[PDB]
Write a protein that binds this ligand. Structure first.
Ligand SMILES: *[C@@H]1O[C@H](CO)[C@@H](O)[C@H](O)[C@H]1NC(C)=O
Ligand SMILES: *[C@@H]1O[C@H](CO)[C@@H](O)[C@H](O)[C@H]1NC(C)=O
Ligand SMILES: *[C@@H]1O[C@H](CO)[C@@H](O)[C@H](O)[C@H]1NC(C)=O
Ligand SMILES: *[C@@H]1O[C@H](CO)[C@@H](O)[C@H](O)[C@H]1NC(C)=O
Ligand SMILES: *[C@@H]1O[C@H](CO)[C@@H](O)[C@H](O)[C@H]1NC(C)=O
Ligand SMILES: *[C@@H]1O[C@H](CO)[C@@H](O)[C@H](O)[C@H]1NC(C)=O
Ligand SMILES: *[C@@H]1O[C@H](CO)[C@@H](O)[C@H](O)[C@H]1NC(C)=O
Ligand SMILES: *[C@@H]1O[C@H](CO)[C@@H](O)[C@H](O)[C@H]1NC(C)=O
Lengths: 337, 49, 28, 241, 49
């Protein structure tokens, strides 16, 4: 009852005459809704991981993934991936959300230098072949392909750049084969003193140890941004619910509130809106291009007017800032008071 | 403000990271917003004086 | 007259304002 | 191959003053009755811009693409047709080309056998599309469309996204304010250095009117945009002026 | 004052440590120094009264 809440707040068994601000009331949600795009085509993850032969590290392959559904249960079909490292997101079933664009980069390197595909690393790979941004957001998948790429006599299918004047900026590809001059005398396109060819071959051999077996690496880059999402997780939508305190998930935007009609003059390119406090106030329905308002469910403060407990046990309750027509009357266990 | 966190939205952090590692992120936001509240009360107390 | 939405935006963050006990009629 | 207009006569370009132009929407978010500070690539206020008069006068040069370009043209009779972009401006490597039809718009990004001066034009002799080797992205949609028509365009190539902003207002740069709503975004992920505009001359040995198009360059600057009711940008302030 | 970091000279943090790990150590220095300035302003307001 209100009196016992006063005692529990004051941490005392007797209460003096006065008014005490005990807690705040608020309406609990009733149901939950989810709204996602209705597309059904899947993303071409098959070709990226099932390619017959991968590209070189100094010239890596780049792929655009868009306008599809990215289900990550497919990746548990081939041999176990011995390395699954993600940055900015957890891979354990938290990858079922909406992204804006996806870049897929694939190459082949050695095992000992696999730890070089990471932010803030140094080495031949990091600054001469493939560099990652400091604020990287994505996942790197490394597995062993020693049975396929490596050969007894060594294959020259894969090469890496050893000499370069300056470090590579992140996501920059260099395919130049010009001689690396480092002395006064000209190189004239041939090697010699301070004249070098930047390209060197791995020459993988199965007889090599653990640190030299070839490894295939696929680097996935996402971009969580306010722009409309093309690729999304495999989730089921739900009918639109309005004028009820409900949960909602509009393309990954989770929240609790009330959705109603809006008079916002949304220009065709504008997706959602914001208020002065830089928080979401309006949203666009992904399936019908409808503009909906977000309003938090009813809330307020409660005070209890008590005479001294030595006098009486009756109390009065003051709902602060309520017009008395919206004072919460619902009983079916949906109030946080 | 972000206070060094990945994002300034509580819902985004909880829907993107595992609860193991989400604690080191939410702690920055909670402590950072606790400082903002404490600063405001301290200035309010001086003005009331 | 000489001495004198943003309020609704603040209320939704948990910032509210209590009215004074003595109204302007009582003070006059 | 095309006709080498050897009669082309070079003249020093003129310089005009763009007063408050080049303000666009830097984000997809909707805001209203707020003052928001944005750091992006903008056109600095009261900055002189090259002015290339055409028609006689025939100025169709190759110009660098310094991180983004603000292009305007105040003419009638839809004299201006499209633009071409690339790094070497030849058939050797990649180039982007945008051409508006009389009812359509076509974008192609591939190796074109560019001549000295690509041009447009009853209608006939369609050599305009000389050769396409291997083209990846194609896009066709609704057409982009004193003197009456005024056209402003902003081309920016960042983050692999080529963004075009545009505005048509009824009307030596006029006075007023107008934010350029986003129009078209094409992901090509290409690297571009120089560009040159294209137009048409009406053959009878032709009878074409005069034209004038301006070129301006963007810089990293901080702007204070004013959003009114309905979410329309009415004013801006250049903090570093 | 190191505030529990390896060193106070912020150049040393940027050299010895890797950029992923340096940012965590640097974040500690700013948060401590921001508080030190914030404490000074509060003391000054009390004295000014
Ligand atoms: C979205 O896809 C569903 C198929 O499940 C279809 O019935 C619906 O009409 C589509 N939405 C629109 C706006 O056409
Ligand atoms: C690759 O092919 C194999 C054999 O058919 C099989 O695992 C599956 O079809 C493909 N794997 C993936 C991950 O697409
Ligand atoms: C409170 O409810 C009454 C009855 O519906 C209504 O007339 C009034 O406008 C509401 N608001 C206030 C501030 O009285
Ligand atoms: C003349 O035009 C042809 C094809 O249009 C071109 O190959 C040639 O370079 C041009 N000559 C000059 C001097 O511009
Ligand atoms: C026009 O261009 C520059 C651009 O910085 C401007 O500052 C200057 O006033 C003008 N210069 C010339 C040579 O006209
Ligand atoms: C441009 O499109 C119009 C309308 O379809 C057409 O008449 C004209 O021939 C086209 N121009 C070309 C194909 O060069
Ligand atoms: C395109 O790459 C060249 C490489 O020399 C560079 O100079 C230029 O700045 C790049 N283009 C843009 C728009 O940055
Ligand atoms: C906003 O739009 C409404 C209707 O579209 C119009 O009546 C009102 O004048 C507009 N406000 C402006 C232009 O400031």
């Amino acid at each position: 009852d209100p009196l016992s809440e006063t005692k529990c707040t004051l941490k005392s068994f007797t209460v003096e005459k006065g008014i005490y601000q005990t807690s705040n009331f608020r309406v609990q949600p009733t149901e939950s809704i989810v709204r996602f795009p209705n597309i059904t085509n899947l993303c071409p993850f098959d070709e990226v991981f099932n390619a017959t032969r991968f590209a070189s590290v100094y010239a890596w392959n780049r792929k655009r993934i868009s306008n599809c559904v990215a289900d990550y249960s497919v990746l548990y079909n081939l041999a176990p991936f011995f390395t699954f490292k993600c940055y900015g997101v957890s891979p354990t079933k938290l990858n079922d959300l909406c992204f804006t664009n996806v870049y897929a980069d694939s190459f082949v390197i050695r095992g000992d230098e696999v730890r070089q595909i990471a932010p803030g690393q140094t080495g031949n790979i990091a600054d001469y072949n493939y560099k990652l941004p400091d604020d990287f957001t994505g996942c790197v998948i490394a597995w062993n392909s020693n049975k396929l790429d490596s050969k007894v006599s060594g294959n020259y299918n894969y090469l890496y750049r050893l000499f370069r004047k300056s470090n590579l900026k992140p996501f920059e590809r260099d395919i130049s084969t010009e001689i690396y001059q480092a002395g006064n005398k000209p190189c004239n396109g041939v090697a010699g003193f301070n004249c070098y060819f930047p390209l060197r071959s791995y020459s993988f051999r199965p007889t090599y140890g653990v640190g030299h077996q070839p490894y295939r690496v696929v680097v996935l880059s996402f971009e969580l941004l306010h722009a409309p999402a093309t690729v999304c997780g495999p989730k089921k939508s739900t009918n639109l619910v309005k004028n009820k305190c409900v949960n909602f998930n509009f393309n990954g935007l989770k929240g609790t509130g009330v959705l109603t009609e809006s008079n916002k003059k949304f220009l065709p390119f504008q997706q959602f809106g914001r208020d002065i406090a830089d928080t979401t106030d309006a949203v666009r329905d992904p399936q019908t291009l409808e503009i909906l308002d977000i309003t938090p469910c009813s809330f307020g403060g409660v005070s209890v007017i008590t005479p001294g407990t030595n006098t009486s046990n009756q109390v009065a309750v003051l709902y602060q800032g309520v017009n008395c027509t919206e004072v919460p009357v619902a009983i079916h266990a949906d109030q946080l008071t | 403000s972000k206070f060094g966190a990945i994002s300034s939205v509580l819902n985004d952090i909880f829907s993107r990271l595992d609860p193991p590692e989400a604690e080191v992120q939410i702690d920055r936001l909670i402590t950072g917003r606790l400082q903002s509240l404490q600063t405001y009360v301290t200035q309010q107390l001086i003005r009331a004086a | 007259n000489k001495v004198t939405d943003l309020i609704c935006a603040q209320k939704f963050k948990g910032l509210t304002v209590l009215p004074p006990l003595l109204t302007d009629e009582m003070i006059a | 191959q095309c006709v080498n207009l050897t009669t082309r006569t070079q003249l020093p370009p003129a310089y005009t003053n763009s007063f408050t132009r080049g303000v666009y929407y830097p984000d997809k978010v909707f805001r209203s009755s707020v003052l928001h500070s944005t750091q992006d690539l903008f056109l600095p206020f009261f900055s002189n811009v090259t002015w290339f008069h055409v028609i006689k006068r025939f100025d169709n040069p190759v110009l660098p693409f310094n991180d983004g370009v603000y292009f305007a043209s105040i003419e009638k009779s839809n004299i201006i047709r499209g633009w071409i972009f690339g790094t070497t401006l030849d058939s050797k490597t990649q180039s982007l080309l945008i051409v508006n039809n009389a009812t359509n718009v076509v974008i192609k990004v591939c190796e074109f056998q560019f001549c000295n001066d690509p041009f447009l034009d009853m209608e006939s002799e369609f050599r305009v599309y000389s050769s396409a080797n291997n083209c990846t992205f194609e896009y066709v949609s609704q057409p982009f469309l004193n003197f009456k028509n005024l056209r402003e365009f902003v081309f920016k190539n960042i983050d692999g996204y080529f963004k075009i902003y545009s505005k048509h207002t009824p009307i030596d740069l006029p006075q007023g304010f107008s934010a350029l709503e986003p129009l078209v975004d094409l992901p090509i992920g290409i690297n571009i250095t120089r560009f040159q505009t294209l137009l048409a001359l009406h053959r009878s040995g032709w009878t074409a009117g005069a034209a004038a198009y301006y070129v301006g360059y963007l810089q990293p600057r901080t702007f204070l945009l004013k959003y009114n009711e309905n979410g329309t940008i009415t004013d801006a302030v250049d903090c570093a002026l």
